[PDB]
Design a protein around this ligand. Structure first.
Ligand code: 05L
Ligand code: 05L
Ligand code: 05L
Ligand code: 05L
Ligand code: 05L
Ligand code: 05L
Ligand code: 05L
Ligand code: LEU
Ligand code: CL
Ligand code: NA
Ligand code: NA
Length: 503
């Protein structure tokens, strides 16, 4: 079985797994929608009581499974719990990352296309003071790129360029994945991570240089880092915070587990996991939180910035920010840097969310790396057309897989690993070979606090939380996908059998 060549490579690979579009696109919006500072407290708490422990747990399960030649949850869950229902539940470990990849890769392709067009200077030309006269051109830019519906039909009409760019994006993901773990994901990580850091820092500085009659970036920072204790009793804020934690730390996606399955049986996972998580958090609250929000607040003020954040999920990153940059000298190239950053983050995450499927095809169905990668890319590519041509399909997929699925699957994996498999055994497995030991209290946090916290979370959210019929188009399909995957697992367990009878 493949293994991470170096420690640094491992750390940067995991960090590249976590640090993605969620840091620079999702976080700003989530924090802005929930009152900025009022969103941080729960966030921080969610990081301590959920993020860290689940990270460690997934690292542990990953390494454990990898020691026996398994990297995906269908087999790992069965190793931890000898029950068919464990395999069935394990299917989600492939389903979630697949579905998420299906749209994630597309958004990534967006970032790539924008990078290209901004580099060549093929961008909108806003009339040199009316805010709408400046934003409108960019909004039209995006809408024309992805093909936002102009009528009543829920149909998207992506430009030829966007499609070709998606093709190329897929080709790059494949070019990285086909070289494997050490020569592919690791090697690339060692470049993309530094590059990403540099770009992010530069952008942060440039943004900090912004000042208008409406305010400065410091106002944005203040908006983001000022506590509001009157929202601590609001369930919604907590739900948002935890969701953001899950998404940003790649928890419940089966990606961390698969990546960890390539860590040598003896190699530490405590300090490594903690370091990756910490890196992601620094890239999120410090870098991702000091770009979009501070700029939007500097140019429009707090209220208007919040309004923009609530507008949508892509408004701030693909429309507002580039529009703001266009008002400065070298703003186009600045936009280029922005979208390039976004592209690298995206890529480094996407490869991570396709590696699970690849690893299932390799480990369980005994496919070669080439064939596994190619078939995975085929499934993703084909499935992506639904996201490309059906309006709000992306939203549905993101809700069922990227929101519900990750939390439910987190609770599931926690229950299987720390309850069924054994709390003491799980603790032992986690701390084994650790450069540092997990604080004693975290035993009680993992066994009692985290599971109850989640459970309560899911129950409250489901109880307190009207769509277009076309949603059923997506659901259906993804459901199918699940079934598909299930069947594969079946085939797998059959092959195993036939293999056992022959040995
Ligand atoms: C390096 C080659 C990159 C240039 C390819 C651009 C193909 Se995208 C091109 O861009 C125009 C400006 O937004 C759009 O209005 C037009 O509709 C679209 O075809
Ligand atoms: C998920 C199923 C998606 C397959 C639909 C393929 C669209 Se087919 C092709 O595509 C263009 C792009 O919008 C259309 O405008 C054009 O009218 C149509 O001929
Ligand atoms: C899997 C169902 C077949 C889907 C056909 C592939 C998309 Se069809 C492809 O799409 C581009 C982007 O809209 C169009 O601009 C181009 O004219 C059209 O040929
Ligand atoms: C490297 C990025 C890929 C660049 C692909 C550009 C080819 Se897409 C570009 O879009 C125009 C708008 O329809 C077409 O009329 C034109 O023929 C076509 O070249
Ligand atoms: C899965 C999402 C399906 C949307 C793809 C539509 C391709 Se284009 C679609 O084609 C129809 C004729 O077939 C036209 O009447 C309709 O106005 C046009 O939107
Ligand atoms: C940056 C990573 C891709 C994120 C794409 C957003 C999925 Se779409 C976004 O998702 C929200 C869920 O929090 C919905 O509430 C919101 O209405 C929808 O626009
Ligand atoms: C939410 C959990 C907070 C994590 C804070 C961990 C610092 Se807890 C720290 O851990 C040491 C090793 O167990 C103990 O010996 C020491 O007494 C205790 O202060
Ligand atoms: C689904 C995950 C790969 C997302 C990633 N952790 C991000 O923050 O962008
Ligand atoms: Cl375009
Ligand atoms: Na992240
Ligand atoms: Na990434």
């Amino acid at each position: 079985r493949e293994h991470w060549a170096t420690r640094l490579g491992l750390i940067l690979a995991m960090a590249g797994n976590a640090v993605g579009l969620g840091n620079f696109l999702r976080f700003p919006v989530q924090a802005a929608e929930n009152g900025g500072g009022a969103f941080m407290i729960p966030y921080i708490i969610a990081f301590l009581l959920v993020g860290i422990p689940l990270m460690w747990i997934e690292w542990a399960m990953g390494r454990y499974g990898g020691a026996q030649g398994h990297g995906t949850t269908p087999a790992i869950f069965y190793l931890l719990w000898r029950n068919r229902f464990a395999k069935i539940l394990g299917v989600f470990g492939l389903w979630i990352p697949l579905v998420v990849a299906i749209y994630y890769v597309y958004i990534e392709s967006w970032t790539l296309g924008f990078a290209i067009k901004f580099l060549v200077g093929l961008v909108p030309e806003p009339p040199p003071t009316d805010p709408d006269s400046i934003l409108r051109p960019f909004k039209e830019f995006l809408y024309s790129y992805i093909g936002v519906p102009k009528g009543d039909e829920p149909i998207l009409k992506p430009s030829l360029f966007a499609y070709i760019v998606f093709l190329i994006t897929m080709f790059i993901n494949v070019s990285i994945l086909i070289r494997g773990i050490s020569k592919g994901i690791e090697r690339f990580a060692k470049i993309a991570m530094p590059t990403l850091f540099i770009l992010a820092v530069f952008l942060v500085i440039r943004v900090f240089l912004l000042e208008t009659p409406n305010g400065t970036a410091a106002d944005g920072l203040n908006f983001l880092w000022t506590p509001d204790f009157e929202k601590l009793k609001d369930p919604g804020v907590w739900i948002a915070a935890v969701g953001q934690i899950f998404f940003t730390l790649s928890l419940g996606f089966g990606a961390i587990i698969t990546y960890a399955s390539y860590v040598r049986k003896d190699q530490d996972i405590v300090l490594s996991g903690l370091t990756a998580a910490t890196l992601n958090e620094k890239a999120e609250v410090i870098l991702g939180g000091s770009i979009s929000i501070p700029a939007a607040v500097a140019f429009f003020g707090v209220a208007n910035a919040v309004a923009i954040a609530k507008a949508g999920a892509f408004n701030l990153g693909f429309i507002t920010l580039p529009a703001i940059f266009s008002q400065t000298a070298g703003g186009t190239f600045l936009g280029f840097l922005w979208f390039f950053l976004l592209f690298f983050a995206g890529l480094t995450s996407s490869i991570a969310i396709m590696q699970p499927m690849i690893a299932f095809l390799e480990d369980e169905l005994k496919l070669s790396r080439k064939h596994a990668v190619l078939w995975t890319a085929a499934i993703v590519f084909f499935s992506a057309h639904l996201v490309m041509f059906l309006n709000k399909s992306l939203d549905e997929m993101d809700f069922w897989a990227g929101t519900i699925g990750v939390v439910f699957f987190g609770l599931t994996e926690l229950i299987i690993f720390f309850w069924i498999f054994g709390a003491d055994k799980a603790w032992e497995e986690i701390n084994r070979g650790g450069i540092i030991k997990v604080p004693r209290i975290y035993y009680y946090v993992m066994r009692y606090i985290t599971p109850a916290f989640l459970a309560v979370l899911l129950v409250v959210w489901a109880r307190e939380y009207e769509t277009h019929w076309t949603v059923w188009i997506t659901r259906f399909y993804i459901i199918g996908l699940f079934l598909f995957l299930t069947f594969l697992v079946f085939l797998a367990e059959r092959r195993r059998n036939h293999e056992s009878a022959g040995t």
